[PDB]
Amino acid sequence: IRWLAAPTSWSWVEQANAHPMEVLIDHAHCERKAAGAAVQMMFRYLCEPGLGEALSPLAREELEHFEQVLALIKARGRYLEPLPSPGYGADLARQIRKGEPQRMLDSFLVAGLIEARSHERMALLAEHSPDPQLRELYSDLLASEARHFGLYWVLCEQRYPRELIVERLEVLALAEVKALEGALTRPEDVRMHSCGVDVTQ
Ligand SMILES: [Fe+3]
Ligand SMILES: [Fe+3]
Known part of the structure; x- marks a missing residue:
């Protein structure tokens, strides 16, 4: 299974390296939002x-990550700030069809896409951050993020015929890429899911 339809642009890696704390704070918010989305799906x-x-342990693990990142934020002299989120989340949410059984499928696939894009970007910072502490943080998180998009795939595979899943993911993966197109307005606007994708392939 290939989740993502295009890789992140090096532009984003440069921006994330220039404003690491904005990425880190946003990342803590992303982990908490992921826990929240899992709990809302369960309700x-x-x-x-x-x-x-499946989702109760996932939500717990996302909260553990929130707590881990928050501890590092404070170790670096800052706290959680209300940094406005990029349009990405809402753009993806808009793709989720109303009405079952399409809604469940779309919800799992959207959650998995967001996790896959986080993993892909964390993998880039694990290798390319100039800060060893950040390389270590992001490296430490990779395995768990891969288990999480793996889980969302498995939840679809248990309930739906495979080609239905593949076909819908292809559509949603293209929407996920469109949600990352554009140019960053200001350096401090960088986020885990701010704009920066390479569409040339
Ligand atoms: Fe996480
Ligand atoms: Fe995760």
């Missing part, structure tokens, strides 16, 4: 077999 699908078993 929507209250008694769905297997779902609580």
